[PDB]
Amino acid sequence: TASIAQARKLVEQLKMEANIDRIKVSKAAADLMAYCEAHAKEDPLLTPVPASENPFRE
Amino acid sequence: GAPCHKFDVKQIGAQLLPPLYSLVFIFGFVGNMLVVLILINCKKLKCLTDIYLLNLAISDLLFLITLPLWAHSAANEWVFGNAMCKLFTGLYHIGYFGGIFFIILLTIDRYLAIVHAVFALKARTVTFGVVTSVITWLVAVFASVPGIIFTKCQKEDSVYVCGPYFPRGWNNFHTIMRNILGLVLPLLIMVICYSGILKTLLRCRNEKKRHRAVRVIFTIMIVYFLFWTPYNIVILLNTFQEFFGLSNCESTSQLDQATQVTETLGMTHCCINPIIYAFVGEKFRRYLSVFFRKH
Amino acid sequence: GCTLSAEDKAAVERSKMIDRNLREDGEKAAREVKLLLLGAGESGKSTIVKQMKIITTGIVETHFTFKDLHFKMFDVGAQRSERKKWIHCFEGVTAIIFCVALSDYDLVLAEDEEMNRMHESMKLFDSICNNKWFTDTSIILFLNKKDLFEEKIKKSPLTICYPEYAGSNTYEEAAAYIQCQFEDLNKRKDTKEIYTHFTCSTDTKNVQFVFDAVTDVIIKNNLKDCGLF
Amino acid sequence: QPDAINAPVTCCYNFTNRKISVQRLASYRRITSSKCPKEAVIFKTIVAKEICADPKQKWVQDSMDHLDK
Amino acid sequence: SELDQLRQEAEQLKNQIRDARKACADATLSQITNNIDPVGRIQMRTRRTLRGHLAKIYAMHWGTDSRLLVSASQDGKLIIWDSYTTNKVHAIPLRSSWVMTCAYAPSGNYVACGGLDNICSIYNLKTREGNVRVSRELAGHTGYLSCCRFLDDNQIVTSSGDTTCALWDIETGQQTTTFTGHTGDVMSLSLAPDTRLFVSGACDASAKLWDVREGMCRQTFTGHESDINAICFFPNGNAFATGSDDATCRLFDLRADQELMTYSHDNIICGITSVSFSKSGRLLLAGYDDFNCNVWDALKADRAGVLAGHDNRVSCLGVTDDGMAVATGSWDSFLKIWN
Amino acid sequence: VQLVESGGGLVQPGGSRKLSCSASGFAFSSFGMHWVRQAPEKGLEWVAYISSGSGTIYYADTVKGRFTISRDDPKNTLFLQMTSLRSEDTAMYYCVRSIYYYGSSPFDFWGQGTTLTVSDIVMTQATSSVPVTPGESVSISCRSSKSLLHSNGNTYLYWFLQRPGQSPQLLIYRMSNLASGVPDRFSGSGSGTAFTLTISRLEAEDVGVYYCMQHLEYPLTFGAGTKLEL
């Protein structure tokens, strides 16, 4: 009864999820590589910061 | 022809006393230093028992620091410091009375926690512990003051000695006060507190933990009696020396050697105190394990 | 404080005021005794909640006092979503009061008729008692509705709930066997003491039993703190 | 302090001694140690024998005066 | 009998989705990023330690100025810290001590909290009186509240253990949108930078991407043996990381609907409580249950470094918006700031 | 939010007078408190400060040894006890509320003040009278005797408005912030020694005497004051 309608909503949700324009994995890998390489200068946790610029000191 | 006491006893004491003092210093220093480091690393403020154990360890360290110095002093050669003598004597007495009074405080704390748990929850506070510790150190220093006042450095027969020079009445009084403070009062507190503690422990269902606790309590009482009591008895006998047993030339030398051995025994009890209090405890063992895993 | 400005020093003073308030509130909170109330839905725990109280969904807190000792009882019955993802919050509690009824054996479970209710309470007790978070936490077990159990036990034998049971139909023997099975469920006999009581009409007796069990737990905790064990 | 170090080198348990002539007194070493039951006079004789003397007697006082001067 | 045919249809649709994901799987991320030089040994250092909590600390959130910290504990108090001076700015008493989440407003005017009381309480910090006051109590969830996040001042995304997720309006006090479809308790929320999407991690080992404006589930992710404890968005918004009780972190692609990468080690067997990223996105920071945090190279899966110094279970990891520092809270009642 | 000062009146010189301020509508125990005095024609003068926990107390150099400040938290009152009064003490007495933490705004609320009649960093504020037609932006300059830029990057400058017949209202705190309830027309800037208050689109409500205040170190000092006529 109610579980039949719930399974119908689950099948409708899977039907909506199936029709998506997914893309190649290599393009997203290149995009993540480009974003990590492009912003390396703005990462204080990866590039060390001099003590005059670092507000956390002993 | 009056000379009875001679250098032969001094020869035996000089030969055997410094290595014995050195062994006591090594074992005591290692154990007490380890206990102090663990307590500093741990949250001493949270537990009242930790505060009193730390004060006991500090009293033990203050007692033990002067042992190489007295070991050198055993050779009968004394450094030319009068204030140095009055400082080493003060450190020795402050460490001794600190050890006795903080053992009494640990006993009273265990009685208060076990017998009256509900009252202990409201009553036990960090502020109360700090106030009691400061007052206890003041009482220990004030008790050590009469020893310090008469302590002097004098040269007899071209030999320097750091020694006490009590008057007639004060010397008799000091032995009685030493006996009352170190033997009668702590044993009385231990028997009165531990009887109630054992009576409360009887209610506990678990057999193995109950028997281990009973063995530990009896071990503490028997260890305190066996170490401290002969020393106090020999001190009382030597101080009186007329009413109890005649001042026989042969007997007094044996009393002096017994005084040396019982002195070593009472000093050894200070070394065995950190094991008996800290190491027996499972909580301290867990702290030790965490300290070794972290470091 | 020389490098700090006036507003910085006043901020430090405000922080010290906040620190003293936090310390005083923690000292007040540490003295209070926390009790976690568990059991099945049909266990009749509401009856004892009514009894302790004299002397919207979520955690139901019950504050009361007895012999100048403050008890906070936490009821988690309202939320049936999960038991594994929040019970670690209750790790630091003095005792767990676990309540089951003795008239549950004749009544089958509503969700599944095949499964009995007392066996579900036993699986609940086994999961809570053998949990890794509560290895040192004591359990105060309450057996409710003893009069209804007497009225049911005279009409029907205990053989329905226990297949492998040979014993006299006496009320005391049946209650003792149920208590023995619940105690036998415990797998930590050297760290965890289980206290069992039969609920009575008198309000004072149940509270006195809880007070005695809490006193035993506090004495064991103090003995552990001192280092005698 | 340790009592072991504080052991007195010389003490006077008892005296059966009698009066000593002024010429027989080679040396004088007063002892007032707190660990002995009485204060005492160590009359060191010429034969290197130490004789205990009670300091309250009259001839012992005269001998202490004469040796002092 | 229609249920069995409809289940078979659902199985056919799932087979279609698996075949599409397999067809798109041209290459592996680890195969591509081998040319990139490694980050080397990242040795971070404790610079500030925050003290004053007494019970277990469960949650922390950074402000947008990278200086203020909200911290939540079982003491029943929220503490607002100044990170540069270690001073306490606020101490807020709570009506219930069973608080498991906290959030700080992007404007900085409000702080929300919640937990086992099933009520989300929102506190006004800026008042013409010197007391932080309860602005609004939100109710309607039946399960325990796991995570709360602010889209803005007037809207809250709140997830709980009743398997649902609610968007809330403070002024009305009524939930506007209810997100449903999870089959297990929801543990964590990660909010997108553009505040148009959020991803929900639940016990049923599925991470779902939700559209906040439309109100419908648009994407579903799988591949975890155990429950999803913590989830964090990548800075661009096209990927996210997922932590679990399987001692594995997984980097998932939002656009291709595929598991990009798995971070795992043989010796590490304990669960994961918090997941966070650096500002660039090269370092993934995860707090485990063997009492330490690991910094992972995001694009090469190597362990870049180990942060340690807590004595109990690490519970929460914040990274500042400007990327200067990492704050770590745990069950030893301490907060440590790392650089 | 309300502060009601009582007492005042005519006191013979050498007498003792007690001022009581009643605080209503806010959590009095969390705020620090100040006393400020205004002469009939002269500028504002700082008198005394008491902390929220009554832990630290500061007095002005002129009022040391004569004025005693007291804070009664369960009755929400401030008491200022005055002895050895003299002619200079004749003034209007304002109670000032203040709050101190990161991001706060002290000097936010001012009392009505009582009239008592008896029978250091120097802030330069030159241009007393400014004759500008309304509808045109006006600049107000406040020169300081030393740099107010602290090592933590905060510059401790305060801009107040006292319109005729009312208490001084806070306008600008720390020169980069706008007080709550104040329109965005007011703004300010500075270099660390020279400071500028910029007021655009002058309305009839903006008629009053503007004041410049230094909070870097005690005693707190005020400017002479610029008068705006419209």
Numbering used by the authors:
A (entry chain C): 6 to 63
B (entry chain R): 29 to 323
C (entry chain A): 2 to 56, 181 to 354
D (entry chain L): 1 to 69
E (entry chain B): 7 to 345
F (entry chain E): 1 to 119, 137 to 247
Q: Paper's wording?
A:
Chemokine receptors are a family of G-protein-coupled receptors with key roles in leukocyte migration and inflammatory responses.
To obtain a stable CCL2–CCR2–Gi complex, the wild-type full-length human CCR2 was modified by replacing the native signal peptide with prolactin precursor (PP), followed by a CCL2(1–72) sequence. The most N-terminal glutamine of CCL2 directly interacted with CCR2, forming extensive hydrogen bonds with the extracellular end of TM3 (C1133.25, T1173.29, Y1203.32, and H1213.33) and ECL2 (C190ECL2, G191ECL2, and P192ECL2). In the CCL2–CCR2–Gi complex, a vast number of residues located around ICL2 directly interacted with Gαi; these interactions included electrostatic or hydrogen bonds formed by A1413.53 and K150ICL2, as well as hydrophobic interactions formed by I1423.54 and A145ICL2 with Gαi.
